[PDB]
Structure formats: C-alpha cells, structure tokens
Amino acid sequence: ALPEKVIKAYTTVGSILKTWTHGKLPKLFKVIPSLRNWQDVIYVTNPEEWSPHVVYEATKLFVSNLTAKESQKFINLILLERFRDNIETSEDHSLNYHIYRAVKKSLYKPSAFFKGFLFPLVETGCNVREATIAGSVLAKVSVPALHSSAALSYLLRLPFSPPTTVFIKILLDKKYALPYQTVDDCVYYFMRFRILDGSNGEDATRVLPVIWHKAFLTFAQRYKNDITQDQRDFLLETVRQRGHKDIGPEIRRELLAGASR
C-alpha cells in the first residue's frame, strides 16, 4: 500500500483535477510522469473524474514524457476508457471535443495508439458510433506508412465486424504506399468472402455492409497496379459472387484497369 502522505496529497490533487480548466496543472500532477510507479500514484487522482480539460492536458503531458510502452498503458487504461464511457453515456452519443483532441494527440505515438487504443477497441465490442468517431481521428492525423500498414494487416486478420471494417476502410483511404505483404493481406481479406463450391465459413454468405464495398473499391482504385494477375482474378471473382449493385461495377472496372506487378 502507498504512504498515507501520498494518498492524502494525491487525493487532493484529484479533487483539483475534477474542476480544472486552465492555467498550470498542479505541480504534483506534473511530476507523476517522472515517477517509476506513475501507475500507482495516478489512480489516486481518480482519472475517471478528471475534467475533460485535464484529460487533454494529461494526454499531452503523459504521452510525450513516457516511453512508448508506458504511453501505451496510459492510453489504454485512461484515455480509451474515457473515450468509451463518454460516448456511451452522452445523450447524443457524441464525444466531448477535449477528449476528441486528446485522442488525436495520442496518435502522435502511433504504436502506442494502435496497441493501447485501436486494437483493444476493435477486439472488445467496438460499436459503429465508436468506430466512426475514432475513425475520423485516424483519417485526419498523418501516420507513418510503416505503422499504418502494420495496423491495416492486423485489422484484416481479425474476424469480420462492421466497426473493424470502418477502420480498415479508413486505413485504405490513407492511400499510402503499402509493403507487398500488406497488399497481399488485403487481397486475402477480400478473397475470404467469396463462395468456394467446398469448405466455407460464415464469411462466404454473411451480409456485407456498404462499408465493406467502399473499402474494396478504395483498395481497387489505389492498389490496382500492385497485385499479381492471380490476385486480380480472385478479386474479380469475389466481385462477381459478392458484388454490390452500384459499387460492384466500379470495383470491377478499377480491377481490370490495373497492370500486374
């Protein structure tokens, strides 16, 4: 257990943080990232009762002063939870703009964001509104092609869900250069929703949302020249079996306009 001087001091800073909106953060709060056991002390400040102002400033403070591994824990244990809590309990299921900007700031350490925020989110019942808000952050902030690609590969290997597909589409829309292994993962992903006349899983017949088709189309526009002829044929077949009324022809068109790598 903690020294009672610690508990007493950081219980009070905790109360200050409930209503803090401007000025300098309490000095004792600003030394927390300089502490080895910052996790033990931070909890005493009662993070879930911090003002949204403090969430923002704390995110700046902690993400830029902790190591990536440590940042990742902050992002996950505090930022992510606040993001979800606030969206679920608000009357219009919107995110307070301070928290919103906190999530943008956390993308400055893209690896701590993907491991601390995004992957836990899509793997723990992310809903469509959560993916739409977090997705808009991901769309607006530049991320290194390398980390972007690696996150795309990770999401493509996950089981299907519409919110995951939202993020997949966002990362495709970045239209960054992709390592050929991520291109391959994209092909394998869209492929796996086709019907193989023997063994099929749910993906072959499940209903596909419009967002899956826009993702397919996006991948087709940007990356038509980076796939093999074999891969082009699997995707053209995917569009034949699973294509969409309006988007399907566009996808086919883009796929046929591509030259093999």
Partner: protein, 46 residues
Amino acid sequence: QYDQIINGYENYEEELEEDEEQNYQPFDMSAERSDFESMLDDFLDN
C-alpha cells in the same frame, strides 16, 4: 523495417506481459526522486 514492427503488433499483449514480468517494482519511496517527500510536504501545507 516492416518485418520488425508487424511482429510487435501481432503479439502486443504478450509483449506487455513480458515487460511487466520484467520491470514491475512495488511502490518504494526511496526508489523515486529524492525530493518527492519534500514536494508532498510543501503541498500538504498549502
């Protein structure tokens, strides 16, 4: 490059496990910055 980083992503949960297994320390006041208690004091005196 990509080789390095994709493996860190695929096993991110395992790496968190291993990092905690290695670097966890219980709270110790004498293991933190030596002005700590002094700062705690100036504060509890407003």
